[PDB]
Amino acid sequence: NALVDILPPDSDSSISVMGENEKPDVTYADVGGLDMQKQEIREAVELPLVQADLYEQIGIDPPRGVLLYGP
Amino acid sequence: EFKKLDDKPSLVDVHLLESKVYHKLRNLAKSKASLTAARTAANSIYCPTQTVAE
Amino acid sequence: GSDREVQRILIELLTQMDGFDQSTNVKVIMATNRADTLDPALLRPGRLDRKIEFPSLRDRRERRLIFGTIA
Amino acid sequence: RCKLKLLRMERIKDHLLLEEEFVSNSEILKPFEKKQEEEKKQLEEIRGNPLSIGTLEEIIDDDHAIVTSPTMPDYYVSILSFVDKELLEPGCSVLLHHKTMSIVGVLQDDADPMVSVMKMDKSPTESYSDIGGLESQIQEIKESVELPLTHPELYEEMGIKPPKGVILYGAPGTGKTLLAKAVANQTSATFLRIVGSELIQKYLGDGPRLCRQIFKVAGENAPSIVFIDEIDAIGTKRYDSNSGGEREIQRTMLELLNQLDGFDDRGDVKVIMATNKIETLDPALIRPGRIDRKILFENPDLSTKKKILGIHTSKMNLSEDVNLETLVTTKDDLSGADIQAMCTEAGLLALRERRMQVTAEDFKQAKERVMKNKVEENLEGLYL
Amino acid sequence: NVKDLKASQRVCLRSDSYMLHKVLENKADPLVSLMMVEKVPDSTYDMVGG
Amino acid sequence: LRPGRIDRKIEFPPPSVAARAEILRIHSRKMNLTRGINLRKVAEKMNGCSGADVKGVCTEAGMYALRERRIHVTQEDFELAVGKVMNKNQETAISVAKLFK
Ligand SMILES: Nc1ncnc2c1ncn2[C@@H]1O[C@H](COP(=O)(O)OP(=O)(O)OP(=O)(O)O)[C@@H](O)[C@H]1O
Numbered sequence A: 001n002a003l004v005d006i007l008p009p010d011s012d013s014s015i016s017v018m019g020e021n022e023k024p025d026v027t028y029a030d031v032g033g034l035d036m037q038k039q040e041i042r043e044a045v046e047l048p049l050v051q052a053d054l055y056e057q058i059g060i061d062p063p064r065g066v067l068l069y070g071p
Numbered sequence B: 001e002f003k004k005l006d007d008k009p010s011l012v013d014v015h016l017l018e019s020k021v022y023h024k025l026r027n028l029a030k031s032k033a034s035l036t037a038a039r040t041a042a043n044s045i046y047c048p049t050q051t052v053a054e
Numbered sequence C: 001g002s003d004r005e006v007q008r009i010l011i012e013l014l015t016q017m018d019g020f021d022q023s024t025n026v027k028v029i030m031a032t033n034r035a036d037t038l039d040p041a042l043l044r045p046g047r048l049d050r051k052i053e054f055p056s057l058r059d060r061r062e063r064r065l066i067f068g069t070i071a
Numbered sequence D: 001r002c003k004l005k006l007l008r009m010e011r012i013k014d015h016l017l018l019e020e021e022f023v024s025n026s027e028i029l030k031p032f033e034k035k036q037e038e039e040k041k042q043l044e045e046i047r048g049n050p051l052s053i054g055t056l057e058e059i060i061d062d063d064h065a066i067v068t069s070p071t072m073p074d075y076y077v078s079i080l081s082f083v084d085k086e087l088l089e090p091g092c093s094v095l096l097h098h099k100t101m102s103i104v105g106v107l108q109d110d111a112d113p114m115v116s117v118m119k120m121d122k123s124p125t126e127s128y129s130d131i132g133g134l135e136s137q138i139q140e141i142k143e144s145v146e147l148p149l150t151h152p153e154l155y156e157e158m159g160i161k162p163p164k165g166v167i168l169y170g171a172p173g174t175g176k177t178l179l180a181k182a183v184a185n186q187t188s189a190t191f192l193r194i195v196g197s198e199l200i201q202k203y204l205g206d207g208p209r210l211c212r213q214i215f216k217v218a219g220e221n222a223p224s225i226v227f228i229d230e231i232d233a234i235g236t237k238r239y240d241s242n243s244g245g246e247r248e249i250q251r252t253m254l255e256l257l258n259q260l261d262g263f264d265d266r267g268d269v270k271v272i273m274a275t276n277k278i279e280t281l282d283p284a285l286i287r288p289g290r291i292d293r294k295i296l297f298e299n300p301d302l303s304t305k306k307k308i309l310g311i312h313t314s315k316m317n318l319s320e321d322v323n324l325e326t327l328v329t330t331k332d333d334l335s336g337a338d339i340q341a342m343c344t345e346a347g348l349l350a351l352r353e354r355r356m357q358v359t360a361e362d363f364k365q366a367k368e369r370v371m372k373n374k375v376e377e378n379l380e381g382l383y384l
Numbered sequence E: 001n002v003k004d005l006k007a008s009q010r011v012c013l014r015s016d017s018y019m020l021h022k023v024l025e026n027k028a029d030p031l032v033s034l035m036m037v038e039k040v041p042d043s044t045y046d047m048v049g050g
Numbered sequence F: 001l002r003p004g005r006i007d008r009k010i011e012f013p014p015p016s017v018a019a020r021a022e023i024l025r026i027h028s029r030k031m032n033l034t035r036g037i038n039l040r041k042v043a044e045k046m047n048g049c050s051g052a053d054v055k056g057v058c059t060e061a062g063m064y065a066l067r068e069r070r071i072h073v074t075q076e077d078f079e080l081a082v083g084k085v086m087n088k089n090q091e092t093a094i095s096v097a098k099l100f101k
């Protein structure tokens, strides 16, 4: 019982990534409606990946988590 | 000006013109941006068949 | 005590949700099927900022889309 | 003013206590005598290192018991037989040895946060004559609650069993809540105080277990006063419908009869109940011989309202402006919490001035606001 | 020693018999449990302004 | 509400238009606007009822400048943002749109 080695922040996973190994079975060519939510999901997800700095150089905070809710 | 006077389904047309002008100036960045605006505005139900075709 | 393990796990979500923030990454996406299971320290902003609603009513062009993509 | 000397006298003795105690410890404590030194040799022989707390499930009478530990293995323990074999009972916490388990010893007291709620953490410094007035309805709580404990002498003379219990009721702001805290300050008997709105939980069956605890502590502590503050808050208060509700309310009421007297035959507990809704209580509790004399409170009359206002104005700064005697006159059979609110608000009007003189003008402005909670929280205003 | 030891102070123990070794610099504060799990910043009067 | 236990009762007014302008101004110093955008002008288009409503004009405006992809928040964003929140303001003043499904 002593700290004798370390383990990287990659290893000792809960489960590996599914976004660069596997790929989901859905795209927005097989989404139909919810066009109203389609404008909202690219604000939250798609724009911070390509450049998170967009929010910062505007001076608006980037949203935190996304709740999806409904029946 | 017609955002102070917004009640208009006639700005849907103005967006589509705006897209065509930008396209022929050969910028697709803001041709896409206006075209996106025009799609959103026609999602609300008042639009002619002609308007949807354009 | 076993129901207190559940609560302890929720507390770690808050800790890691706070720690994650202002980083390039997309702040956690989570979805619910009942919006009566939330708490006022989970739904509170800094954990969940954005609220994308999901209706069942939509409108006639967006219900039209659902008939057509599965068609 | 000029109590400085009394403060210094008191202080001086505190200094003398600090001194004597420190110096005594240091090479005159108990370091150099053989009835400590040789006794502890063989005390530590059978003691650890770990002293491994157990929970006493049951005793067996052969010098053994079955403990279940917090660490989950049982032990059929012995008992060394110097800690007094039968002085330990179920629910006690036991010191087991680091090797083969013997009851090394027994801990009396193990502070639970559940008896913290009942037990006091503050002293109720307002006692007799800061609730002054109702001097005819304090002879039914200091001739049957305070006084038998202070003098069992008077009650040896008549013989029979001493008074048991009281129920206080009347209109809000007659000092009901503080009276109880003021007789328990002076006797210094074991003051448990439990609120009426904590008996009702949104969990079921553990409500009556909480109430059952309160009286076991009372019976364990020979001089005992239990203030149940608010037991009108059992018939107007409910949470969910599956663990609060009617079933919970019935159970708790019945638990309390067994506790208070029932069949238990426990130590002398005085019960003090604040209520003002006296049909939330059993027809087995508002019979007397458990609660003997019953106390009614009415709103204090005008000369009693002079006494109430005199507690409050010893703290108030005074002026040649101030006219106390007209502040009583407007009030007619009103509560002693209106008078207490007027003077606190009169000091709020002083503070706004940013002056430290409280005048007649500050009291009368605050009097009209205090009667406004009775004419405009009433939206009819003048009786329609 | 016991006058340098006090309630709500985390200790280190050495498992030779659980022999109290040193004080632990970090100890728990129960108030931080409340405030952290809630999560609540402080403000000045500029965020009430108006 | 028994008197003796409450000695201060503090109301909060749904804002003035003088107050509603200063709430816009507190949030707009986080933002980077195009110079010459008055926020007194925005507060008069609004009628609001909370300092959250004007917090949402600022928020929505910077999400419109996000879509646009300029650093500066434009005067156009604050026309549209007022009207989005105003529509949402008037749509819980009828009987209340749901916030949880
Ligand atoms: N005779 C009195 N002299 C001094 N202060 C009094 C007197 N009667 C009542 N008060 C004050 O009135 C206030 C309310 O009375 P208290 O809390 O003691 O019990 P109550 O009659 O149950 O009323 P409530 O619970 O509605 O306040 C307290 O601040 C108390 O000090």
Ligand SMILES: [Mg+2]
Residues within 6 Å of the ligand: D177, D178
């Ligand atoms: Mg009271």
